[PDB]
Copies of this chain bind each other. A is one copy, B any other.
């Protein structure tokens, strides 16, 4: 993506080097008092929260390119005690202290706009998925996640749109939709298999009825059309 690529060059030409991360490592963690701007360039992460008793709550998944900020831009204080965990095999990220980010975005408002609108995408995304979960429950949520994965990682084949994403575990798909006990994930997947919306062949899901997914995750479909029209359009 162009704006991301420009942002990447802006950061590098200002002395910020890319870091390489590996599966299961934390780019930032919930016990660090320093807050950061993470430019996740390539790879997949998840935001997590570890509770009092050690329970791990998976709250949000992100793919590069994207901007995750662990602290408020103005106060530089924490927006929440969260970790950012790499779930792809490796990931490339630029880690900027928030105070350094303010100075960087201050000097080029084109990049300020890019980061601002990334936040706007996150806001409307959470609203869209709450909208879909409120109407259709876990089915809307699972349909939404599958739709997003289909738009981002889909490859049309004679067997349907192949979700070309490795390590796409059922519980990993469950977590990304908001479902901890994988009882519900396997069940919803069974309804979608029975109604021929998806098949699971080789190691991937193949979407056979995109219209069905869009029908039960309509607000997330609209979110993708408004936020990423060029990606939405490739499969519409």
> What is A's interface to B at a CB cutoff of 8 Å?
3, 47, 49, 51-52, 55, 57, 59-60, 69, 72-75, 77-82, 102, 106, 109, 112-114, 116-117, 119-124, 126-128, 130-131, 134-135, 178, 180, 218-219, 222-223, 226-227
* Contacting residue for A128 out of B80, B106, B117, B121, CB 8 A: B80
Which residues of chain B have C-beta atoms less than 8 A from A106's C-beta? 109
Q: What is the minimal beta-carbon distance from A215 to any residue of chain B, in angstroms? A: 10
Enumerate chain B residues within 8 angstroms of A81, measured Cβ to Cβ: 222
- A105–B33 alpha-carbon span in the complex (Å): 29
> How distant is A107 from chain B, measured CB to nearest CB, in Å?
10
In the bound complex, residues from chain B placing their C-beta under 8 Å from that of A130 are 59, 126, 178
Q: Which of chain B's residues has its CB closest to A116's CB? A: B73
Q: Is the CB of B74 within 8 A of A113?
A: yes
Q: Chain B residue with minimal CB distance to A127?
A: B59
Closest to A60 in B: B127
Contacts A60-B127, A127-B80 given: A120-B55 contact, CB under 8 Å? no
Known contacts A116-B116, A123-B126, A126-B130, then 16 further A-B pairs from the complex at CB < 8 Å, ordered by chain A residue: A3-B74, A49-B219, A51-B135, A51-B218, A57-B131, A59-B134, A60-B127, A72-B121, A72-B227, A73-B117, A74-B113, A77-B226, A80-B128, A80-B223, A106-B109, A119-B119
Q: How many copies of this chain sit in the oligomeric assembly?
A: 2
Q: Decide: A79 near B180, CB < 8 A? Known: A119-B123, A123-B119, A127-B59.
A: no
Q: A80-B223, A116-B116 are in contact. Are A57 and B134 (CB under 8 A)?
A: yes
A71 to chain B: closest residue by CB: B120
Other-chain residue from B123, B178, B219, B226 in contact with A123 (beta carbon distance below 8 A)? B123
Q: Separation in Å of the A152 CB from the closest CB of chain B?
A: 19
A51: chain B residues within 8 A (beta carbon): 135, 218
Please give, as numbers and ranges, the residues of chain B lying within 8 Å of A109 by CB-CB distance.
Answer: 106
Contact B114 A74 (CB under 8 A): yes
Chain B contacts of A222 at CB under 8 A? Answer: 80-81
Q: Which of A47, A131, A178, A180 has the most CB of B within 10 A?
A: A131
Cβ contact within 8 Å between B79 and A120: yes
The residue of chain B having its C-beta at the shortest distance from the C-beta of A119 within the complex is B119
